[PDB]
Design an enzyme around this catalytic site. Sequence first.
Site, PDB file in Angstrom:
ATOM      1  N   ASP A   4      -8.940   4.156  -2.418  1.00  0.00           N
ATOM      2  CA  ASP A   4      -9.860   4.417  -1.311  1.00  0.00           C
ATOM      3  C   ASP A   4     -11.166   5.049  -1.792  1.00  0.00           C
ATOM      4  OD1 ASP A   4      -7.863   3.355   0.285  1.00  0.00           O
ATOM      5  OD2 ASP A   4      -7.195   5.269   1.119  1.00  0.00           O
ATOM      6  N   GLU A  37       2.640   5.213  -4.252  1.00  0.00           N
ATOM      7  CA  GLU A  37       2.668   6.341  -5.190  1.00  0.00           C
ATOM      8  C   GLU A  37       4.045   6.992  -5.407  1.00  0.00           C
ATOM      9  OE1 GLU A  37       0.209   5.885  -2.937  1.00  0.00           O
ATOM     10  OE2 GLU A  37      -1.085   4.982  -4.464  1.00  0.00           O
ATOM     11  N   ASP A  96       0.831  -1.208   0.000  1.00  0.00           N
ATOM     12  CA  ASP A  96       0.000   0.000   0.000  1.00  0.00           C
ATOM     13  C   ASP A  96       0.862   1.253   0.000  1.00  0.00           C
ATOM     14  OD1 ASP A  96      -2.295   1.495   0.021  1.00  0.00           O
ATOM     15  OD2 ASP A  96      -2.862   1.008   2.086  1.00  0.00           O
TER      16      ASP A  96
HETATM   17  C1  LIG Z   1      -3.896   1.854   2.033  1.00  0.00           C
HETATM   18  O1  LIG Z   1      -4.206   2.331   3.352  1.00  0.00           O
HETATM   19  C2  LIG Z   1      -5.208   1.676   4.146  1.00  0.00           C
HETATM   20  F1  LIG Z   1      -6.204   2.538   4.343  1.00  0.00           F
HETATM   21  C3  LIG Z   1      -4.640   1.322   5.519  1.00  0.00           C
HETATM   22  O2  LIG Z   1      -3.525   0.440   5.390  1.00  0.00           O
HETATM   23  C4  LIG Z   1      -5.744   0.430   3.438  1.00  0.00           C
HETATM   24  O3  LIG Z   1      -6.799  -0.180   4.193  1.00  0.00           O
HETATM   25  C5  LIG Z   1      -6.263   0.854   2.076  1.00  0.00           C
HETATM   26  O4  LIG Z   1      -6.958  -0.233   1.448  1.00  0.00           O
HETATM   27  C6  LIG Z   1      -5.071   1.261   1.222  1.00  0.00           C
HETATM   28  O5  LIG Z   1      -5.504   2.156   0.189  1.00  0.00           O
END
Ligand SMILES: *[C@@H]1O[C@](F)(CO)[C@@H](O)[C@H](O)[C@H]1O
EC number: 2.4.1.161
Lengths: 781, 781
Positions: free
Chosen positions: A444, A379, A376
């Site tokens: 998100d 970017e 995660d």
């Molecule tokens: C990255 O951040 C989070 F919000 C927390 O780790 C993840 O749940 C989310 O799916 C990702 O975009």
Amino acid sequence: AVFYKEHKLRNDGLVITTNQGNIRLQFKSEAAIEVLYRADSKQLPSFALAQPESAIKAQLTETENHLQFSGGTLTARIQKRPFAISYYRDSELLLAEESGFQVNKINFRFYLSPGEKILGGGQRILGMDRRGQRFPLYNRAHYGYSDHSGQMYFGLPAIMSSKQYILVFDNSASGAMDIGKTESDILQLEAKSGRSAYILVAGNSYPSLIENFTQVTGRQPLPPRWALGSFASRFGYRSEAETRATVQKYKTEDFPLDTIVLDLYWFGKDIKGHMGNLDWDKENFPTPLDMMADFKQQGVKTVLITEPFVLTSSKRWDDAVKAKALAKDPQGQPKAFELYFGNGGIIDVFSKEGSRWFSSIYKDLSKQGVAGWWGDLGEPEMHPEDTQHAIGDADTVHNAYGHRWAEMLYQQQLDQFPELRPFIMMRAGFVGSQRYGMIPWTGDVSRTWGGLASQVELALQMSLLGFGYIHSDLGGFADGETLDKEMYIRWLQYGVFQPVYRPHGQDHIPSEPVFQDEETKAILRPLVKLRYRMLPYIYTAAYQNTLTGMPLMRPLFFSDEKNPALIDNKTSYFWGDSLLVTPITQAGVESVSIPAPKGVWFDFWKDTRYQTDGAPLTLPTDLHTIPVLVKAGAFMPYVPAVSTTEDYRSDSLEIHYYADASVPLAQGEIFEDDGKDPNSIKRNQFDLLTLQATHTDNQLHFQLARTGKGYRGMPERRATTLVIHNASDQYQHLDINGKTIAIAQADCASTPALACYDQERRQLQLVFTWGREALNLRLHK
Amino acid sequence: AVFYKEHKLRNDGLVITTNQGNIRLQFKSEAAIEVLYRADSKQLPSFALAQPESAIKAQLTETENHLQFSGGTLTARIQKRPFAISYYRDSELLLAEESGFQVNKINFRFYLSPGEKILGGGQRILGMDRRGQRFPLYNRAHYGYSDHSGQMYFGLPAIMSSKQYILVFDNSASGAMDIGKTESDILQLEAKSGRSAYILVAGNSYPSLIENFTQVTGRQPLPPRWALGSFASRFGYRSEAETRATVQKYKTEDFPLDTIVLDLYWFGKDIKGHMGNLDWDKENFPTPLDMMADFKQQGVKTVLITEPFVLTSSKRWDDAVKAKALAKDPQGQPKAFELYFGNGGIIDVFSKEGSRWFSSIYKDLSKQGVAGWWGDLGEPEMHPEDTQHAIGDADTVHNAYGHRWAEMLYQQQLDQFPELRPFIMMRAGFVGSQRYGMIPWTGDVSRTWGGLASQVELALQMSLLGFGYIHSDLGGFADGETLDKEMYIRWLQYGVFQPVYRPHGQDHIPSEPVFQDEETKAILRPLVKLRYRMLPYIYTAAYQNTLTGMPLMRPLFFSDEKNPALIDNKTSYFWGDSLLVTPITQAGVESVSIPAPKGVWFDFWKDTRYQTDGAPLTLPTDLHTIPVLVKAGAFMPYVPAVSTTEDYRSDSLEIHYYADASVPLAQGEIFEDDGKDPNSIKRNQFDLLTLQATHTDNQLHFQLARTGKGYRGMPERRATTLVIHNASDQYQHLDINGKTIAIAQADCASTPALACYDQERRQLQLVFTWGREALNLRLHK
Ligand SMILES: *[C@@H]1O[C@](F)(CO)[C@@H](O)[C@H](O)[C@H]1O
Ligand SMILES: *[C@@H]1O[C@](F)(CO)[C@@H](O)[C@H](O)[C@H]1O
Ligand SMILES: NC(=[NH2+])NCCC[C@H](N)C(=O)O
Ligand SMILES: NC(=[NH2+])NCCC[C@H](N)C(=O)O
């Protein structure tokens, strides 16, 4: 003012000298050319090319005013004065430089043809045709997006034109794309720094274009079959007990489950302050090896989240600094900056030290039992301009960070487990990242109908440019205060017909379908089971994606390449070859108009036959399904539902053929292997089942065959039920390999009939054994 | 006139001489005595006793007019003049000889007490209390029986009295029983020949009586767990293709299936003329080894029918004659007689030659892949009086033929596969046949409501006298011209709650649930799945049956041994300890009156709580279930449904506890082993889970534990969901092994809660990990 001065042709690249410097042209295939300006100077290498150093033999011809550098199908036409390159397929102009390359900043300017439609840029919510738009090339979070975005997690410096070419800006730096916005007839590419090159790929059809594109940028290795199963996920399970309780809930609620995903609480009790620990929070996950082993006993894999950032408050800060694993400032010290999660630095995946350090951590956790990996914030979500990586500053390498992160992890996983296929899910990459197995999701997204309504556009845009497993957080991720039940249901229904089945959301509202009310579960359970029953269909599309880059989701415009107006459609798409899916993306919708291509179509749920000469089809909606049509001539293969792909078997096959005289010839295939060998395709360790239907006035004939060397555990003989929809009521007999069998005309559901026709359903059912030898089934009137 | 003359006491048997001959008395246990008249002469051995030669140490005391031969609990009181033996437990008279033994024919006459109720005789449809009835002891077919029969396939020369003794006529010959019919106060046993002995067994309760009975006649070895699964059967699959199509139908219709059963077409294309072939009809079953292997790959066993008869037209006639395998006539030639199927003889299972010949055939077929065996027509269905067996003529050995057939096959299977449990299903046996694993079914019942309505009486009568796996052809077997849908549904619903799940019928009407209409399947599918989910409950009852003879189906009268009126009930019964089942046995029934024992009961389907001080409970009926009540204090254990027991796992357990303050102490157990090891119990290779509830005014406490040495593949830790029905809304906290956990009071279905109370359902759910160490869960107000 730029003009030609001289050229050299060795080898086999064309090196041109203008009054302004050197330009290197190299064919990476018969259909794709790399054009490198400032070829004289040192610059970042290509990231987009799977084989950057390759250069196939081309032909060069010269005239008074032009040079021609020609491969199989693609030709570069080089005008000497003023200097300008244009590109042709056959004798059709694809793309022409205007001013072309301009220097300090990097700038490429091309003409756009009138009427030319332009897809691309990766994730944006702007309309399928991005012409008339300008947007940045800078991977960046767009938390809680809904129905609009000019800039999101995973941009691609690439476009696909209705002229059937793909243009790649092979540059990793902070930049921008102006697609005929500022100047109606100009496509402008810009970057603050980085490599000054572009790659043009041509094709004679959209499938061929994508095949040629992935040939040179990389083909996705077949994912493990478990990637196509049901994921349990939320942000986030707070403890081992909660994680175990969730696996158990899938068991007690009778929903299939292959994989549980652990968000950031696996390494710390708070959202802030622990990132970089990259190790179990033993207060809340006291026995993680036992936990993972217990899940494996139930056929359930464990996937952990990881991030690029190491916080100064984390247990690994001192060690990372000691190892020189972090990006630095111009002074040479580790660069620390204020993230949401706290003060921290970024692991330099571009350096030897950072790669070795980070890789060693993945290795250790994988040894403990972790089956796959979630990366995660690649970017990178925050990336200060003064950050220095081994190969350039933040702004120069930004859009390739996630790409290199995937490469590092992919190489690591293959070195540790050469007999398994890596599972790598990430938010940000670059052109070509699919060759490292990257499975991206659209970030998100808000828990709104708008968020859902944007997913087809996003998926298609990413699918067309190399990313077959693009998908969304099913049900929505961001904010909300109470579940929007109708939206959630629609999103998880759509989920069945898109690449990865992963409901995921912030945990104040449950994301997993097993935590929903009785009506919701009654609707979704048979659909999640359908996903599993359809594994032969989905896994075969995956196989084709690995072979040819053909995306699993295909846009409506593939159905008629001479109708460019179809390019605008972002509401109906093809799931594999045979299903036209139209997700419901607003509340209370009572019916839908489906722009089905000319031909014969069947209601997937009700078996209703529709025929159309072009006019759209109107179908009523219901809460338990979304509208799906099956193309006449389709072979739809199913196996019995299992709880986990670890239990997958095709000893029993059920295949539905949608017969119509309008389709006199049809073909289907089913790809079967052990679901796990990364080398199965290369070594031919698979069982490829083929089906051919020949449909004439008085006969319907099926030819069945199998090829490939097979694999360990492959069934020698499969019990097969072939259901022929819209079957004539006039077939009097069946021959199976020459042996005549009577067709029963009653009690089809209530006898062990080998051939029976159901007059009320217009279905003809054949039951037989499909062994290794060819099989011919002939129905005759 | 008979009187005592002398006795000898060595050893440790009592040998009494009367003016008429010798009588031998031997205790086979502290609670059971064998009384042999004509002890002087040579006669057939005992068939009923598991250890015929045993004789435990007893005490003998003498007085002027009496002898007393006394074991632990049972005492024989021998009156000298006139000679008569009577039997006492403590100082309570159980049974007294009247005239006792009388000679030529064999005749025993006993007094019956006023009010004494008498069950027994095995399969008859006469009313639970058979006093006032006279019937033959001669195993005989009763094709198409419905609501009455004085003579059927599987008679037993044994009775159970409300005085809590069991009397066995240890005689195999054509005979009769007169239970106070001809003379109101006389029980008469008669036989044309055979052994002149009886065995009396006493007990202090019905469970203890049955434990003592099976101690001396034999305990059933635990069947393979697959015996508790779903059987596909009909009379009969006509071909390999049809058999394969039926297995496939279970797969495509999503009904569980463990075993397919092949009737007589596996060895010939016609009903007549082929019996004795005992080998595959290759015209219709061309590749039987592949067929059986393909089924095993899908977790499906194959069972074949066999019969005692070899026809003169069969391929094995000449060989059987050559081998001297057949019963003979007085001349010494093989005896041939006209059966329904043609002219043929009977395999002499009583001879060495017949046993070796027949056993060799079973061995060969078993090597080919046959998993279990069905022995039909073992009455024997036709048995001419002049037929000579190695040990006596037909009329002398008749009722022991099937018994010896089971012994032969059991011994054979154990010799071939010492690591597997034999599956032997037969129609006719003798007292003690359960020790050879005999699984009996109630023969060719008609497809009528009357046939269904008789099944509880039949099952209970056989269950009480040693046969835990007695069951019926579900849905009915004989005749009919079109399916009686409501009857069929009711029969297969009842089927879930009786020992073996085997729908079977003549194939002009489908017997398998997968060949039924949509409504029928929608009703039965979740019920067949329930059967599988309840395997821990059923398999634990099986374990108890192997340990103590406790039948799986228990009569209502067990609920109050001081209320003899309950003995008449043949409409409600206990399935295991905790479920009171009342099958619906007429069409259109809208409600039922359930004579539930005093206490608290819950509706199994609806969770409704009923309390009764003795008055019956009235419940409404519906088509999708039959009325089932759960006893307060019950622990009902479940695992997730699987398609075949080969896939059985208990990694995930769900246990429902029915709480009520009226039950301050409750216990449950779950027996787990590998489902296949015949030695698992003897060697303690099992995992025995125990649960204890303690329910006080302010606390509900559960103590969980495991014993046994475990077994290969046993889960170390089971994810467990404990659902407490009728839970107080006043529990404020939970302690698990001392660690306090808050009880959530909302969103129980929608969160991974570890403890949550559902106020609308009055259910408290606890989710936890059950490992190898003891676990204490304490709820406190
Ligand atoms: C990255 O951040 C989070 F919000 C927390 O780790 C993840 O749940 C989310 O799916 C990702 O975009
Ligand atoms: C014995 O005979 C049969 F009718 C034919 O073999 C069986 O189907 C029946 O179940 C059994 O009683
Ligand atoms: N990547 C993006 N397009 N982000 C837009 C964010 C807009 C939002 N109002 C903010 O400034 O936080
Ligand atoms: N075992 C029996 N009770 N059989 C009764 C058979 C009666 C029937 N009417 C017959 O003679 O064929």
